Amino acid sequence: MSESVQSNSAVLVHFTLKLDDGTTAESTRNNGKPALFRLGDASLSEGLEQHLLGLKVGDKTTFSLEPDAAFGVPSPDLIQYFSRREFMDAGEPEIGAIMLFTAMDGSEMPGVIREINGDSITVDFNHPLAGQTVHFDIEVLEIDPALE
């Protein structure tokens, strides 16, 4: 069912993302919060899956990946236009100014204010530190049942 990792099967993971300086681009282990990696183009791209296969539960593996296969492609789909009136309480925002914003899951995601319009604010929720090659460690804590 989910004894070992397979293509299009999700995994419960504790991981951390490291730059060449070994800098933490993203953590999902130090925060004490695990995450699930949805295999099969369900959330992550095949590139990540294709390097995760063959491992078993209770093991951990470190591997490198292209941006798309890591933090994915930056996503204009999250772009949302709010009013300046919504930002004024925190000061009128700037063009190309990325400030930490608040998702529904409470998660504070980076948000690049793309442009400032006289009545409206151009917001741009892009992804994590994507668009660059990053080294990450990934643990197999438990594998999600493949009901294929």
Q: Three-state DSSP class for 49? A: helix
Going by C-alpha positions, the residue among 99, 115, 103, 26 that lies closest to residue 65 is: 26
Are 55 and 18 in a shared domain? yes
Does residue 59 lie in a domain region?
yes
Could you tell me which residues come within 8 angstroms of residue 89 by beta carbon, excluding any fewer than 6 positions away? none
Q: Are strands 134-139 and 11-13 parallel, antiparallel or unpaired?
A: unpaired
Are 117 and 105 in a shared domain? yes
**Three-class SS of 104-143:** CCCCEEEEEECEECCCEEECCCCCCCCCCCEEEEEECCEE
Going by C-alpha positions, the residue among 75, 116, 82, 78 that lies closest to residue 97 is: 116
Question: Virtual CA dihedral for 69, 75, 77, 79, nearest 10 degrees?
Answer: 160
DSSP-derived secondary structure for 61-94: EEEEE-GGGTT-S--GGG--EEEGGGTGGG----
125 touches 78 (CB < 8 A): yes
46 DSSP assignment: H
**Domain total of the chain:** 2
CATH code assigned at 112: 2.40.10.330
Query: What is the spatial distance between Cα 98 and Cα 117, in angstroms, rounded to a whole number?
Result: 16
Domain extent, residue 44, equals 9-72+130-144
Are 87 and 64 in a shared domain? no
Going by C-alpha positions, the residue among 33, 35, 43 that lies closest to residue 68 is: 43
Elucidation method:
NMR
25 touches 129 (CB < 8 A): yes
What is the torsional sign of CA 77, 15, 70, 39?
negative
CATH code assigned at 66: 3.10.50.40
Are 105 and 32 in a shared domain? no
Give residue 109's identity as a one-letter amino acid code: M
Q: Are strands 35-37 and 11-13 parallel, antiparallel or unpaired?
A: antiparallel
